[PDB]
Design a protein around this nucleic acid. Sequence first.
RNA 1: AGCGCCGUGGCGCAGUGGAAGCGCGCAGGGCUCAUAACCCUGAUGUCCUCGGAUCGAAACCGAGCGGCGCUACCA
Lengths: 267, 470
Amino acid sequence: TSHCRFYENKYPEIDDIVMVNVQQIAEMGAYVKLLEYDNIEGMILLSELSRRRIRSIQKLIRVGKNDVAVVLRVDKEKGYIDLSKRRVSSEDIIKCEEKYQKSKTVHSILRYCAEKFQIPLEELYKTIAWPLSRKFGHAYEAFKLSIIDETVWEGIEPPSKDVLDELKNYISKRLTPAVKIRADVEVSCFSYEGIDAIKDALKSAEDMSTEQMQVKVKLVAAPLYVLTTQALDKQKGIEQLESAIEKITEVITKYGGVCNITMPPKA
Amino acid sequence: GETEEEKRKREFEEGGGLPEQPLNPDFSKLNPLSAEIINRQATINIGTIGHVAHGKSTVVRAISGVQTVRFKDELERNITIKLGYANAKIYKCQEPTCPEPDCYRSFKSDKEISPKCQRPGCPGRYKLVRHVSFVDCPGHDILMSTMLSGAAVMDAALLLIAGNESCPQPQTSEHLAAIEIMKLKHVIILQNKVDLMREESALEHQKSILKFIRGTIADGAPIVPISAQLKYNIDAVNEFIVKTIPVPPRDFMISPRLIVIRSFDVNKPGAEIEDLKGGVAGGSILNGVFKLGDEIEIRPGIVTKDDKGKIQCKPIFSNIVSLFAEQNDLKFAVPGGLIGVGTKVDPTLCRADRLVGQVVGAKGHLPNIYTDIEINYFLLRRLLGVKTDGQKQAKVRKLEPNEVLMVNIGSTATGARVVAVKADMARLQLTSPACTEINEKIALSRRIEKHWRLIGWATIKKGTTLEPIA
RNA sequence: AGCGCCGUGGCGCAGUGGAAGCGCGCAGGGCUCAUAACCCUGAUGUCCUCGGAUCGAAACCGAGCGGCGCUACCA
Ligand SMILES: Nc1nc2c(ncn2[C@@H]2O[C@H](COP(=O)(O)OP(=O)(O)CP(=O)(O)O)[C@@H](O)[C@H]2O)c(=O)[nH]1
Ligand SMILES: [Mg+2]
């Protein structure tokens, strides 16, 4: 029971960019289904099909696959779509490819949710997806902040709480990303004692490791020491590793040696 | 049904094993071949000289069994910049009945004091006459400072000549003259190829090799047919080493010193740095006993350049953590060989070719850094290493002011500029710091055919000193 | 030794969260009197092993097979 379109209104809009699964081709193109809005079909017309000249009709369509699309005039009376494929900007295709995949994942999760709860998708998107899209602009960003922050479900009225529990479990299992921020610090020392200073630096860099983020400067060479961190929020590893670099500098400036940075902390 | 490893173990136990060195032995009575010294350290440094693509590490491997790394991907096959090493022990059979030529046998350092005799029929046991270290030298025409530094290290020579090739190899003559330069006279001639060459070609190559070495300084150099892969005529090599080559006078009456040629950063990748090791400099001790626990400094060390362009030389004091030699960590170091001194020197300092040709001294001495040096130099008449196709081997020219010359003071590789040229004396300005200890036999090379070419010898007579900054 | 990279249908690229991919190859057919150009359909996958969650994984991850780029021979 797959239904319940991705965005606010059932019908396409003015100059909107979508994507289409194609099934059938009669004479003037293909009146074929959508999977960005409900499940309605639309005309792709041959004069407005491809950039090159239309040499073949079978190759460029690829029945049963995903394709770019733009709607010109929406038949907001009965459910018809006039649709285009040629006039989508090269930068526009890829950004819609995002929007489309963005929309698809939320449905992929809430499908599993409905099929396991046998509640029609319409009610689930009504109760959950639409308030999330209203609050955060995208249900995908709402899901990501749900992984981080629990307060995303406050102000929402699920049809049942077990839906929330299983959705949270499935999102923590499937939508799990902890980005590895890594850096390299070059020891350019020529000084008196360097290995004791390095041990002190490693201890002072490793005792700082928190419960959630643990920093281990691993060895791959003498000058080049590698700093690996698991940034849970993609914004704390930077400050951790900057503090680490400051502490390395505090170490090196007085024993006699010198060190330099080769790569700073990067995601 | 005893496994081979347990068999080697019972052999090691029956051989006496490797006893630990005494912590503080009476150093007045310790001769270089004492059991406390020779069972766990090499005392004579033997180097292999020869033309490229002749096989020098293979010969030492057939003698000893220890491989010479041959690292750096590209250098896995062509030529190696840094010196290759192998430990060898000379075990002589105690039984008189077995023939003398096969009594000698060269074994790995991992062997024990008294290993069993492998000849079929001889129950007797071997006696370790001496441990010998092998300082392999690059044999190429571009890498020239490395072989001169190795010659500064080594104490006995093995010359390598191919049989089926041309007799008058120029690289071998260059090596022989270079060894002749620094008061070293014990060279043994070794014919690499004997299997693939005939009986009368054997006499012809013998005669050619004899005719080559008639006017040089070395006159009584033995010749031996050897094979690097057949693993034969190894015992006679050890015999010649034992008989012809004595120990030069070296005792503990002299002040301690060090000459580092290789750098080694002990930094095991992947493991936690909470368990890490120090920095190891590979150095020869030409004079002075060394022990576990010392304060030692390299003299040129940190070479910095200020905003005014003057060169500042910071000596690098370091507390030695260990003195690795042979196979086991030792408690006393026997001078006259390369020992890996592992100290608190920063690991990055021992990473690259940074500790290549640098003098080091223990606390209680003050070697002097010099920036302008007065040398007394002598030249040969013809260049060595050039293959002129039948015309008057390149004649050596007289020196010119303001030219870059590679002036290898012992192990140091310096590009000096000439200030004044006399008939026998000269002055050199060194942007790369050099130091003076006593006399420091020097080698000289220049640039005409691109790569460096040896010309003659030099000895320091005077210089301008730069006080190390505390 | 470790850090980044990767895993053909013959090949190079691509998506990999819903199950077999493109283009070039090879086979066959079409157009032409006839060839190349062009147009159609194919026959080829343990998309590298052991596992996992999941109605789903070549694909998302991990205890490893294989080969590169990098530090680089680390006594
Ligand atoms: N037929 C034969 N080949 C030999 C003999 N000795 C060495 N070789 C070959 O020489 C080749 C080079 O070996 P290698 O020892 O690495 O050369 P090298 O002496 O290190 C190069 P350089 O002299 O410049 O230092 C090897 O392939 C080896 O098989 C020999 O006695 N007979
Ligand atoms: Mg070599």
